[PDB]
Amino acid sequence: SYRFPEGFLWGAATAAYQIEGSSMADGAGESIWDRFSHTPGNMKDGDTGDVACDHYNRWREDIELMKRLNLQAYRFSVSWSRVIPQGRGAINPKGLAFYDRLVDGLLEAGIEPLATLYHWDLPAALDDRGGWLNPDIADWFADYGQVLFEKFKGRVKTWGTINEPWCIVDGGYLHGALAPGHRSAYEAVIAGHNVLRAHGAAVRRFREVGEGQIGIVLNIEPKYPASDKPEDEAARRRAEAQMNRWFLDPLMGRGYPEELTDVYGAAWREFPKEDFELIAEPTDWMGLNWYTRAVPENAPDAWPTRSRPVRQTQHAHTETGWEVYPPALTDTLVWLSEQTGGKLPLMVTENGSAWYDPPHAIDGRIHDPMRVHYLQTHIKALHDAIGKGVDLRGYMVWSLLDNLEWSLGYSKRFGIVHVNFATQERTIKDSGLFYAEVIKTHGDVLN
Amino acid sequence: RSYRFPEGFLWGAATAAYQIEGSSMADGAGESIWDRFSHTPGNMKDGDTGDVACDHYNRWREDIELMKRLNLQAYRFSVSWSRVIPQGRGAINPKGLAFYDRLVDGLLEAGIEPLATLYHWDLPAALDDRGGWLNPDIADWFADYGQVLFEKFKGRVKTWGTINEPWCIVDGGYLHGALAPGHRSAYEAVIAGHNVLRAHGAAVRRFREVGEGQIGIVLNIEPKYPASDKPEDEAARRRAEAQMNRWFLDPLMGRGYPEELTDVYGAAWREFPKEDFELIAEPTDWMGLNWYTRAVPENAPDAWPTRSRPVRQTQHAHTETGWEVYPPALTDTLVWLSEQTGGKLPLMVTENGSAWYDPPHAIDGRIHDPMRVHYLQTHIKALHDAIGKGVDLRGYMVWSLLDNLEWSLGYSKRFGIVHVNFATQERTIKDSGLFYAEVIKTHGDVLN
Amino acid sequence: RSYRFPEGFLWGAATAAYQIEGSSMADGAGESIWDRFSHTPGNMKDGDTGDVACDHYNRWREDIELMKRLNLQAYRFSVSWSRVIPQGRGAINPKGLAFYDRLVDGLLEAGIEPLATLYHWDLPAALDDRGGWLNPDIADWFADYGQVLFEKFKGRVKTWGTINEPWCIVDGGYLHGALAPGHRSAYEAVIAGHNVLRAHGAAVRRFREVGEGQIGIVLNIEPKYPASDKPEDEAARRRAEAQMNRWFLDPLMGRGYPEELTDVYGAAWREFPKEDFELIAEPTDWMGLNWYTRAVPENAPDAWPTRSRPVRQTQHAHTETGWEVYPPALTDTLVWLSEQTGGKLPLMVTENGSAWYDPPHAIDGRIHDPMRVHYLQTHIKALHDAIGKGVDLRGYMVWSLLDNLEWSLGYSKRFGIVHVNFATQERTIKDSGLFYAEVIKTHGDVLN
Amino acid sequence: SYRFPEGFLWGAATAAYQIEGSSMADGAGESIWDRFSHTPGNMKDGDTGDVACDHYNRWREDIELMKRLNLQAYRFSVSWSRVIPQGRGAINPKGLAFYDRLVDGLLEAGIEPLATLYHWDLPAALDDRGGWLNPDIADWFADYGQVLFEKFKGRVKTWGTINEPWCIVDGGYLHGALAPGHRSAYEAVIAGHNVLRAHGAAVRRFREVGEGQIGIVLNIEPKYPASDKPEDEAARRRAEAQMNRWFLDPLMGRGYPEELTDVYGAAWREFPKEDFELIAEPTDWMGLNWYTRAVPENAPDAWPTRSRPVRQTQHAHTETGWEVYPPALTDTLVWLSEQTGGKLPLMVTENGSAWYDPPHAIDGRIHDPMRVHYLQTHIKALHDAIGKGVDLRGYMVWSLLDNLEWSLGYSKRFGIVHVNFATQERTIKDSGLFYAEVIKTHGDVLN
Ligand SMILES: OC[C@H]1O[C@@H](O)[C@H](O)[C@@H](O)[C@@H]1O
Ligand SMILES: OC[C@H]1O[C@@H](O)[C@H](O)[C@@H](O)[C@@H]1O
Numbered sequence A, D: 001s002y003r004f005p006e007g008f009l010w011g012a013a014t015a016a017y018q019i020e021g022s023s024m025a026d027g028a029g030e031s032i033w034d035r036f037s038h039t040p041g042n043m044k045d046g047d048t049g050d051v052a053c054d055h056y057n058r059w060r061e062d063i064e065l066m067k068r069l070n071l072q073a074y075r076f077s078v079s080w081s082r083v084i085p086q087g088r089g090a091i092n093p094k095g096l097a098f099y100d101r102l103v104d105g106l107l108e109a110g111i112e113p114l115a116t117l118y119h120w121d122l123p124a125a126l127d128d129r130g131g132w133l134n135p136d137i138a139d140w141f142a143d144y145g146q147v148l149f150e151k152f153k154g155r156v157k158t159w160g161t162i163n164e165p166w167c168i169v170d171g172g173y174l175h176g177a178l179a180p181g182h183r184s185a186y187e188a189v190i191a192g193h194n195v196l197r198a199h200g201a202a203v204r205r206f207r208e209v210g211e212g213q214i215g216i217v218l219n220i221e222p223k224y225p226a227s228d229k230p231e232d233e234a235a236r237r238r239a240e241a242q243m244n245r246w247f248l249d250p251l252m253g254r255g256y257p258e259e260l261t262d263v264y265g266a267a268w269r270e271f272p273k274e275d276f277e278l279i280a281e282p283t284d285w286m287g288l289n290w291y292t293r294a295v296p297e298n299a300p301d302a303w304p305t306r307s308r309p310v311r312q313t314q315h316a317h318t319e320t321g322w323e324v325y326p327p328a329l330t331d332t333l334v335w336l337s338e339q340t341g342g343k344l345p346l347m348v349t350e351n352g353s354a355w356y357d358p359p360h361a362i363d364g365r366i367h368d369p370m371r372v373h374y375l376q377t378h379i380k381a382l383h384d385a386i387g388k389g390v391d392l393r394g395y396m397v398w399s400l401l402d403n404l405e406w407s408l409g410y411s412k413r414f415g416i417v418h419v420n421f422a423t424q425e426r427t428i429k430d431s432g433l434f435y436a437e438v439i440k441t442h443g444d445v446l447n
Numbered sequence B, C: 001r002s003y004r005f006p007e008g009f010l011w012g013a014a015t016a017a018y019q020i021e022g023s024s025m026a027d028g029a030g031e032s033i034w035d036r037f038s039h040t041p042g043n044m045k046d047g048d049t050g051d052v053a054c055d056h057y058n059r060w061r062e063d064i065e066l067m068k069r070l071n072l073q074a075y076r077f078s079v080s081w082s083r084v085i086p087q088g089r090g091a092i093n094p095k096g097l098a099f100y101d102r103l104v105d106g107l108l109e110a111g112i113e114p115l116a117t118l119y120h121w122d123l124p125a126a127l128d129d130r131g132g133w134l135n136p137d138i139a140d141w142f143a144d145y146g147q148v149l150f151e152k153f154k155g156r157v158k159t160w161g162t163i164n165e166p167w168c169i170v171d172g173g174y175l176h177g178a179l180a181p182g183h184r185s186a187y188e189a190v191i192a193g194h195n196v197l198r199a200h201g202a203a204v205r206r207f208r209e210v211g212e213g214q215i216g217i218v219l220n221i222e223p224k225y226p227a228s229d230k231p232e233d234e235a236a237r238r239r240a241e242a243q244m245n246r247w248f249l250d251p252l253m254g255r256g257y258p259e260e261l262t263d264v265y266g267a268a269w270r271e272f273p274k275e276d277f278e279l280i281a282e283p284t285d286w287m288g289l290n291w292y293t294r295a296v297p298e299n300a301p302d303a304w305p306t307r308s309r310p311v312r313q314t315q316h317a318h319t320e321t322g323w324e325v326y327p328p329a330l331t332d333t334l335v336w337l338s339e340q341t342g343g344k345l346p347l348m349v350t351e352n353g354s355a356w357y358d359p360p361h362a363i364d365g366r367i368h369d370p371m372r373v374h375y376l377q378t379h380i381k382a383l384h385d386a387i388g389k390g391v392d393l394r395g396y397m398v399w400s401l402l403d404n405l406e407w408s409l410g411y412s413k414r415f416g417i418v419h420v421n422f423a424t425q426e427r428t429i430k431d432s433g434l435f436y437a438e439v440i441k442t443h444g445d446v447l448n
């Protein structure tokens, strides 16, 4: 049987810059992605988030779609620069009003709104003050958090602080593939620390003025052994430490992983103890974003982890080049349960896959059998995790809509709903239809 | 008998924001609990308010020139919380902060050491509406406020006081209701005292994180002497001593709350979580003593809540506030304090002075206050005596630089070494200020 | 002259939690502001407290049997917020809720309609430490508390009161400090009044979302009659009337705040955001009137803050609380109220009664209170007169079922139609109770 | 600091039947404990007071022991049956001669003799006349008192009348665990009343023929709240009334506690006014016997107070099952000071603890660290009480010797001097050594 526990929450997820469009509309400020996406060479095919899914204007239709998919929850992000154009100071009434209407529309539809404070779109005005390199950001973020905490008190009960610190730092400051496009280990170390601090500050502020549950959202990519060679095991631990333990360990009060000292070398720093007290501020829940695993081997020229993944040719790969391997989800869920002591309620805040779909519907249909396969096998893997005692409270499919996959542009479709970006026409994919059955039957359809 | 003071011993004078500044609603400044309290009938003598006071907000330059004439090496002042952060939390008021920026730059330019106090009784009304010192979150609020100053005046203001006289704040503000916010409750008093201590600790920690220099609290102490050899009177003495002098000092030294408080506050007394005391005992760099007089408590079964009352010591002179003049008790207190802090904590007398009657205007360009002069020389000599007994005393601040608003007692109580004509805002240096200027210049040698 | 009352007209009696229950911190129950207030010396007459009161928490079954002997069709009571939610927010106290569960089931079993009041002056102290009625969040806090009750007693308690007498709460608790929490401030009074109204609105909305039945607020009104033809006396009358009778009623009816308040509170008066008034005017199903007397105000320039004072009406009897006995003013008030509510809102007299001297013990099994009997008969007749004049009046509750704690005036003021011997907790039905029982039985015909 | 007031008297206490032995020797009459202890089932292990500490023969050795301990006072009781064999009538010359020798020996040693008239050993001939149920005992006792008052005039200056009325009545008449082994509430009420009357009569007689100071000795066991349940507070007040206020209140002229009407029900009685005038005869001092506190909860089947103590597992317990909790001593002293108006000089006539000791010394030593701990903490608690204005004039350790703990036999050792009951060998315990140091330094050893 695959019936899920009582109260288990099924939903789907999005992010502001990836779907909203209208980036400068109605008072909204400039974000780092406004700058980044309009700089030549940064984005595939020169794609930008200027229009995206036009969600800012078509959110009502999108909610009708959520209802057709039988969604019980919708996880979304709030654009900081849309709400506070300069990052600090005067609030933008219309910008806040958008999310106000959105949340009311969701509650009317019977859909639980899951809000994320930061999904990679820092206000440019704050980037001009150093962004995540400026320790004061811990306060800025907190204040920003407060604006929402008070505005949606009693309506938004489940809060995420930061979405994937590792992507923000590794993509934004270490390798520069993401906004703000810096490439520096020194900056990567500092930015990671201040992201954690910002999370802690926001949680404290939430304790003072908020109502409900708050937590961080981490992505994890489990690193499997390439061989029994010791240099490869050392490589595996470097990669695992840099990607999976960098943020989790200090969040659990265990400090930074020792291996980071080797990974970042002269760029590594010692931080004040009270910083770690702030960072480990107790949370109510944790989100896991999960897609795949990796099999790292030693790679002396790979900066900075000196490791590289070994291609697992025995399995299918997504268009983002990610191995399809459902058991590794179960394992990860087990592992995380151990790291949090079984004491912290967990939720899969993102899971999904990118495969090729045509740019238009084919007489009113999009047939994506591999996305369907991914969905069913990984959800079964969730059931396996719950059977092993992991406290899993919910599952959010990434993503509700085909959207802007950041620097990879619109070429990577993660949606269970197809978006024709020429016409903004939405078409429910076979995967969405199937997910609607999984929700409807509460998992029994997998039988 | 020589009376030259140690090298580097700092001479100065002290004030507080609401008592001298005026312009309480000016340039974005928020409403404080004293704006409300002073504008409620019956609370203040003669209906006096801090609306104008010494008009210091406008006349600070003149006041600095006066500091120069007095040869002051230090000026101890407080920052109005609501002037800088009108709602207590949130948005900063640029002009309000700019005032203190101007003041500090002006002091440093004059060669005067600025000694800043974060809290001198003027809580933002917006925070009082959220429970004030009864709300534990105030510990955080204060810290944030502290941070704003710590960063703004980093490298300029090196000596920081967190809270000025927790006992006056709580006993006056929450226990008996003679001071803002005018509550009268033992239940509220214990909680308020606890959260005042917590706020101090939080501020010291925040200072360790973001600040530069030395930080400490300022306590008032009124030594309790035996009225008789009767045992109920000694029990009374220890109750009064516990409620006034040990309530805050003991947990600050990591010694927990005085046991006698359980008897003083009875059912209103509470046990608090262990980590609170860890926060409260956060190590400081220095401590300020506010000292004026002693008391001689006797048993008084109907006196709530300490069941004690002072015996009038008619053998000695008394001030306009009714405080006995008795300099040896200063020396004793300093010694006592040195012992309570283990001799390891550098001390400074952050307030000492006396109130006597002065006319409302100068008399041919003069104010003759021989009793204030007497108080001054005898108590400064007492400081020297304390130093000779091994007390690590680093400085002395006269209360006060200016005749000002003595809170609920209004303008009727003059503590200034500089006379203020409140009709014309004209300043006239008193004989006491004059003498003090000579004490500073001779570094104490004038007393010989 | 017949005095038969309308079909379905509901006869009952009323109490309040802190005034009768005792066991105030028992079985998990939290500390309330009255726990603190009553145990501070000087606040209560003879040092009386609500620690024991009528011991109703333990003797509620006996009291129900007493209700049955009086032929009561309804019992109006309040729920102690801190008994049900000890910290005001957060965890529910199962035993505390279980008490009211048993009480309500017992009432329904006896055929007696339970009329429940959410707030009768006993705020949890933990919420007072967060600013109490000065903190806007209380509107939410109250709502959540309301929900707990609405759902627990869904289908059992069909008639709900939100707030009992906003004016006594604010004027007594925040303006003059005669009631808990004992603040004295016009600034605080204005803010507190606004937040009480907001809390009422929030509770009504929450009731619409999760509740079942009819909900409304309970106002006290003291009609102000002319003292003379002097225009300053009429201005005085209008000030007093605005501050006491129109302050809350007008915004509840969507008319905004009385203009005269701008004059009454001066610099303490504030403008509030427009949406607050949308919240305050949330449509209700019924309204309660608490009524005892009238006043005849004259100009009094030194009377803070209404600058008015009542003229003693020596031509009429006065109760032991010093209130004039004048039944026609009840009729007038009801008519007035009917006019202010457009005749559209069902009204109920939720409190009416009188305090006269009774001995502390029964005298051969009896308590003879002919003046209380007189008050009862004349004012009930006045109710009938009011109905004849078109007031949509659905019921009448005698204050009070039991001799109880008259707050700051202690046990010295007996309002009961049932005598309580506070030495022994023995109940004895007074002559007034006997007469009221006959009034209910004959549905008014005894008045013929 | 812990220096005690000048003239503060340090000593130790015993009781006749618990240490003397030779109970019917040298003309001595039969006491109720002679009968009770020789009836099967009454005493643990069948222990009796036939030998005990053989003090009747070894008192000189015991005085040398007092001197080694630096005792300034020795509190002891006189066996009524040893002095007046039939309780009334002829005096027994030898029996009185023993206490004469003892008192002279003590005064010779510089030790202040503190004499107790009655310590639970009523003459059997008087028990056959109804004992404490016969009102005439008030007179009998007076006569007995007179015999001592006149014999030791000028030598014994501090007199106790009755030792612990509550134990006598509750143990002897209510529950029957002590001699004379009655179990009756009716009898308990009557006996309590006549004990109080006997005290008064003895005080009057002392006024007529005696010299010095006279007073009663009460045991108090302060009752603390078990919960916020009202039935438990009613329980607390019942227990408090029956144990702590039953005797103190009429002694202070306040009549009997109202709660007794509830406790004893139909067995409760109203007594003549003049009885209460006799009972309240002004005294010169009062003794407090103190050991522990109790935390009573409601217990409907517990006769007659319908209360029972709740085990306080957070604290140490003695071998008698008594919680170790020194602050309750301080509180009690204050309470007593208040009940007596602060005008009546108080003395702790008994305080101590029972812990396991081996039956023989090792090596010529007894290491009793918990008894030492009890000693230091409770003496410190006395100091705390003095600091709060309580007029406390002295402290007597129970007990000088390991002895017969009545019905619990010799299994409960209270001595600061160990007694090997096989050999009558005395060994001063570590507690005795420490106490000797406390006396010598007048408290300075505590700091
Ligand atoms: O890369 C695919 C997805 O990865 C997730 O971890 C990020 O949160 C999304 O913003 C992104 O679209
Ligand atoms: O109350 C008398 C004076 O002494 C101290 O308590 C305060 O610091 C002064 O501001 C106050 O005016």
Ligand SMILES: OC[C@H]1O[C@@H](O)[C@H](O)[C@@H](O)[C@@H]1O
Pocket: C016, C019, C164, C165, C220, C290, C351, C405, C406, C407
């Ligand atoms: O002031 C007398 C009475 O006023 C009423 O309106 C309140 O509801 C009662 O609690 C109070 O006893």
Ligand SMILES: OC[C@H]1O[C@@H](O)[C@H](O)[C@@H](O)[C@@H]1O
Pocket: D015, D018, D163, D164, D219, D289, D350, D398, D404, D405, D406, D414
């Ligand atoms: O129970 C231990 C001790 O208790 C005391 O109160 C009695 O007076 C002693 O005789 C007894 O040995």
